[PDB]
Design a protein around this ligand. Structure first.
Ligand SMILES: Nc1ncnc2c1ncn2[C@@H]1O[C@H](COP(=O)(O)OP(=O)(O)NP(=O)(O)O)[C@@H](O)[C@H]1O
Length: 136
């Protein structure tokens, strides 16, 4: 019962950029929430999912244990998942989680939203605040 409502760029990132990466990196996840995000950009930008096999790219399945899904393509890599999840993905690449992005994820949470974090390759492009359909 979770849907993306808004995306916010990381330090120095454009908001359209964050929404776009969350959409294609969610095409590979089979979770209903990954569709919730692909909608978020749809209404905001009115765009369509990107075909991975038309780019000869690859989908990255979403697993709950790491809480992460993404997509790979012949010129880019995208990953999105839990804040702890994305921090571990950046460190494995050898990237770093910018404070500004950690602050956006926390304000997403303190506001009652579930902040997901999205990065390109090993760097965070922005964070996503989701509304919870069901209230705890
Ligand atoms: N399309 C998606 N791609 C990548 N991650 C997602 C996607 N949709 C949801 N997520 C994250 O994956 C989490 C769900 O996986 P899960 O491991 O069951 O977490 P959870 O235990 O239910 N939540 P929490 O208790 O806060 O860790 C969601 O809460 C989101 O933060």
């Amino acid at each position: 019962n979770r849907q993306a409502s808004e995306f916010i760029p990381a330090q120095g990132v454009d908001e359209k950029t964050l929404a776009d990466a969350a959409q294609l990196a969610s095409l590979a996840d089979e979770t209903p929430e990954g569709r919730s995000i692909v909608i978020l950009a749809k209404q905001r930008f009115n765009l369509r999912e990107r075909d991975v096999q038309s780019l000869h790219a690859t989908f990255v399945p979403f697993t709950a244990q790491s809480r992460m899904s993404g997509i790979n393509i012949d010129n880019r890599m995208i990953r999105k998942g839990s804040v702890d999840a994305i921090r571990r993905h950046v460190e494995a690449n050898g990237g770093h989680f910018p404070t500004d992005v950690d602050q956006k994820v926390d304000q997403v949470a303190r506001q009652g939203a579930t902040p997901l974090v999205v990065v390109e390759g090993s760097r965070v492009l922005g964070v996503i605040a989701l509304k919870d359909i069901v209230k705890g």
